[PDB]
């Protein structure tokens, strides 16, 4: 066929019941994740092609960057809770990987402050049980698929994207193949 199991996607031997429809994992420490988000705009291009009534979920992971890595998972939980992902994703990626100015939880906090989130509001959220349950959700979803690398995308807890079997000579063409494949998997 044109979309072959084992080629552009793989099927989970241990399918995850009740998983989000489209689930992407990343780390702000992850170089290909920087590419995926900042240069290729994968998340965006997938969303624009998804069927109606199919929502997108994106979670941060702990297994890169040690202590600061975990802080970033909690920060991402704050971002989700306050709904400011689109305001902090770029400065967090650039702070970790471009300027290398994020070295502590306080430096992460600075990014939110600069993005216009009030200090008191950030701190309230950081310290909240709503954010603790969001952190748990992120950890659980990664554990459910025994996740060991990023970037990664799963569809309906049954299918995992396999971009390594795709031509990357043209960035635009790669992105749309990636997006078209998620849409195909979504309709399966």
Short mmCIF file of C-alpha atoms in Angstrom, two decimals:
data_model
loop_
_atom_site.label_atom_id
_atom_site.label_comp_id
_atom_site.label_asym_id
_atom_site.label_seq_id
_atom_site.Cartn_x
_atom_site.Cartn_y
_atom_site.Cartn_z
CA UNK A 1 0.00 0.00 0.00
CA UNK A 2 1.05 3.66 0.07
CA UNK A 3 1.02 3.78 3.86
CA UNK A 4 2.70 0.62 5.19
CA UNK A 5 2.79 -0.54 8.80
CA UNK A 6 6.47 -0.63 9.70
CA UNK A 7 7.28 2.05 7.12
CA UNK A 8 5.71 5.49 7.73
CA UNK A 9 4.21 4.39 11.01
CA UNK A 10 4.40 1.46 13.38
CA UNK A 11 1.60 -0.20 15.31
CA UNK A 12 1.88 -0.49 19.07
CA UNK A 13 1.98 -4.14 20.12
CA UNK A 14 0.39 -2.95 23.38
CA UNK A 15 -2.36 -0.45 22.33
CA UNK A 16 -3.18 2.22 24.91
CA UNK A 17 -6.88 2.47 25.77
CA UNK A 18 -8.30 5.96 26.35
CA UNK A 19 -5.32 7.75 24.81
CA UNK A 20 -5.60 11.23 23.25
CA UNK A 21 -6.43 11.25 19.53
CA UNK A 22 -3.23 12.98 18.47
CA UNK A 23 -0.47 13.00 21.06
CA UNK A 24 2.92 14.63 20.50
CA UNK A 25 5.85 14.42 22.96
CA UNK A 26 8.83 16.77 23.08
CA UNK A 27 11.59 18.17 25.23
CA UNK A 28 12.87 21.74 25.21
CA UNK A 29 16.33 20.10 25.38
CA UNK A 30 15.65 18.03 22.28
CA UNK A 31 17.46 19.27 19.15
CA UNK A 32 15.13 17.61 16.64
CA UNK A 33 12.22 18.94 18.70
CA UNK A 34 13.54 22.46 18.18
CA UNK A 35 13.62 21.69 14.46
CA UNK A 36 10.13 20.16 14.54
CA UNK A 37 8.61 23.12 16.30
CA UNK A 38 10.67 26.18 15.38
CA UNK A 39 11.64 25.42 11.74
CA UNK A 40 9.29 22.73 10.36
CA UNK A 41 6.22 23.73 12.43
CA UNK A 42 4.98 20.12 12.60
CA UNK A 43 2.34 20.62 15.30
CA UNK A 44 0.82 23.45 13.37
CA UNK A 45 0.78 21.68 10.04
CA UNK A 46 -0.73 18.52 11.49
CA UNK A 47 -3.56 20.53 13.18
CA UNK A 48 -4.51 22.27 9.94
CA UNK A 49 -5.06 18.96 8.27
CA UNK A 50 -6.77 17.05 11.01
CA UNK A 51 -10.39 15.90 10.53
CA UNK A 52 -13.08 17.86 12.35
CA UNK A 53 -13.51 16.79 15.98
CA UNK A 54 -9.94 15.50 16.34
CA UNK A 55 -8.05 17.44 19.03
CA UNK A 56 -4.25 17.76 19.53
CA UNK A 57 -2.32 17.14 22.73
CA UNK A 58 1.33 17.99 23.33
CA UNK A 59 3.30 16.90 26.42
CA UNK A 60 6.82 17.56 27.73
CA UNK A 61 9.06 14.72 28.97
CA UNK A 62 11.45 14.21 31.90
CA UNK A 63 14.10 11.93 30.44
CA UNK A 64 16.27 14.73 29.00
CA UNK A 65 18.09 17.49 30.86
CA UNK A 66 17.99 16.19 34.41
CA UNK A 67 16.64 18.47 37.07
CA UNK A 68 15.94 21.35 34.66
CA UNK A 69 14.18 18.88 32.33
CA UNK A 70 11.69 18.07 35.11
CA UNK A 71 11.25 21.77 35.87
CA UNK A 72 10.35 22.27 32.23
CA UNK A 73 7.73 19.52 32.42
CA UNK A 74 6.19 21.36 35.36
CA UNK A 75 6.52 24.67 33.48
CA UNK A 76 4.78 23.14 30.48
CA UNK A 77 1.99 22.05 32.84
CA UNK A 78 1.73 25.73 33.91
CA UNK A 79 1.59 26.73 30.21
CA UNK A 80 -1.24 24.28 29.56
CA UNK A 81 -3.13 25.35 32.67
CA UNK A 82 -2.89 29.06 31.83
CA UNK A 83 -3.33 28.34 28.12
CA UNK A 84 -0.21 30.26 27.10
CA UNK A 85 1.64 27.57 25.11
CA UNK A 86 1.73 29.82 22.04
CA UNK A 87 3.40 32.58 24.04
CA UNK A 88 6.16 30.61 25.77
CA UNK A 89 7.06 27.79 23.35
CA UNK A 90 9.44 29.91 21.25
CA UNK A 91 11.27 31.69 24.13
CA UNK A 92 11.63 28.44 26.05
CA UNK A 93 13.16 26.63 23.04
CA UNK A 94 15.46 29.57 22.28
CA UNK A 95 16.33 30.04 25.96
CA UNK A 96 17.44 26.42 26.32
CA UNK A 97 19.02 25.82 22.90
CA UNK A 98 19.80 29.13 21.20
CA UNK A 99 20.86 31.64 23.86
CA UNK A 100 21.39 29.04 26.62
CA UNK A 101 20.05 31.53 29.16
CA UNK A 102 17.73 29.08 30.90
CA UNK A 103 19.73 27.42 33.69
CA UNK A 104 17.31 27.41 36.61
CA UNK A 105 13.64 27.35 37.50
CA UNK A 106 13.91 31.12 38.02
CA UNK A 107 15.13 31.57 34.43
CA UNK A 108 12.12 29.59 33.24
CA UNK A 109 9.89 31.85 35.33
CA UNK A 110 11.49 34.92 33.67
CA UNK A 111 10.31 33.70 30.26
CA UNK A 112 6.69 33.63 31.47
CA UNK A 113 7.05 37.08 33.10
CA UNK A 114 8.52 38.53 29.89
CA UNK A 115 5.62 36.93 27.99
CA UNK A 116 3.21 38.92 30.16
CA UNK A 117 2.11 36.34 32.71
CA UNK A 118 2.00 38.04 36.12
CA UNK A 119 4.47 36.78 38.71
CA UNK A 120 1.78 36.09 41.27
CA UNK A 121 -0.25 34.15 38.68
CA UNK A 122 2.72 32.09 37.52
CA UNK A 123 3.69 31.28 41.11
CA UNK A 124 0.10 30.37 42.05
CA UNK A 125 -0.10 28.01 39.09
CA UNK A 126 3.39 26.52 39.64
CA UNK A 127 2.35 25.64 43.20
CA UNK A 128 -1.16 24.39 42.32
CA UNK A 129 -2.59 20.89 42.53
CA UNK A 130 -4.24 21.43 39.14
CA UNK A 131 -0.71 21.75 37.77
CA UNK A 132 0.40 18.67 39.79
CA UNK A 133 -2.33 16.63 38.10
CA UNK A 134 -1.26 18.00 34.70
CA UNK A 135 2.33 16.87 35.47
CA UNK A 136 0.97 13.42 36.37
CA UNK A 137 -0.98 13.28 33.10
CA UNK A 138 2.21 14.01 31.12
CA UNK A 139 4.19 11.34 32.97
CA UNK A 140 1.41 8.75 32.64
CA UNK A 141 0.99 9.29 28.89
CA UNK A 142 4.71 8.80 28.31
CA UNK A 143 4.73 5.74 30.56
CA UNK A 144 1.72 4.29 28.71
CA UNK A 145 3.83 4.00 25.52
CA UNK A 146 7.07 3.29 27.29
CA UNK A 147 8.51 6.45 25.72
CA UNK A 148 12.33 6.67 25.29
CA UNK A 149 12.79 9.24 22.59
CA UNK A 150 11.52 12.52 21.28
CA UNK A 151 10.13 13.99 19.14
CA UNK A 152 7.32 11.43 18.95
CA UNK A 153 3.71 11.38 17.83
CA UNK A 154 0.99 8.85 18.53
CA UNK A 155 -2.44 8.52 17.02
CA UNK A 156 -5.33 7.02 19.08
CA UNK A 157 -2.83 5.24 21.29
CA UNK A 158 -2.42 2.70 18.53
CA UNK A 159 -0.07 4.15 15.91
CA UNK A 160 3.36 5.82 16.18
CA UNK A 161 4.70 8.08 13.40
CA UNK A 162 7.92 6.94 11.76
CA UNK A 163 9.52 9.97 10.05
CA UNK A 164 12.90 8.27 9.53
CA UNK A 165 11.44 6.67 6.43
CA UNK A 166 10.75 9.98 4.68
CA UNK A 167 12.61 12.20 2.23
CA UNK A 168 13.86 15.33 4.00
CA UNK A 169 15.48 17.11 1.00
CA UNK A 170 12.57 19.54 0.88
CA UNK A 171 11.35 20.69 4.29
CA UNK A 172 7.85 21.69 3.05
CA UNK A 173 7.27 18.35 1.34
CA UNK A 174 8.38 16.41 4.42
CA UNK A 175 6.06 18.38 6.69
CA UNK A 176 3.03 17.77 4.48
CA UNK A 177 3.83 14.08 4.13
CA UNK A 178 4.02 13.96 7.94
CA UNK A 179 0.71 15.82 8.26
CA UNK A 180 -1.02 13.77 5.53
CA UNK A 181 0.16 10.60 7.34
CA UNK A 182 -1.31 11.71 10.69
CA UNK A 183 -4.58 12.49 8.88
CA UNK A 184 -4.53 9.05 7.26
CA UNK A 185 -3.84 7.39 10.62
CA UNK A 186 -6.58 9.47 12.21
CA UNK A 187 -9.13 8.13 9.70
CA UNK A 188 -8.05 4.50 10.20
#
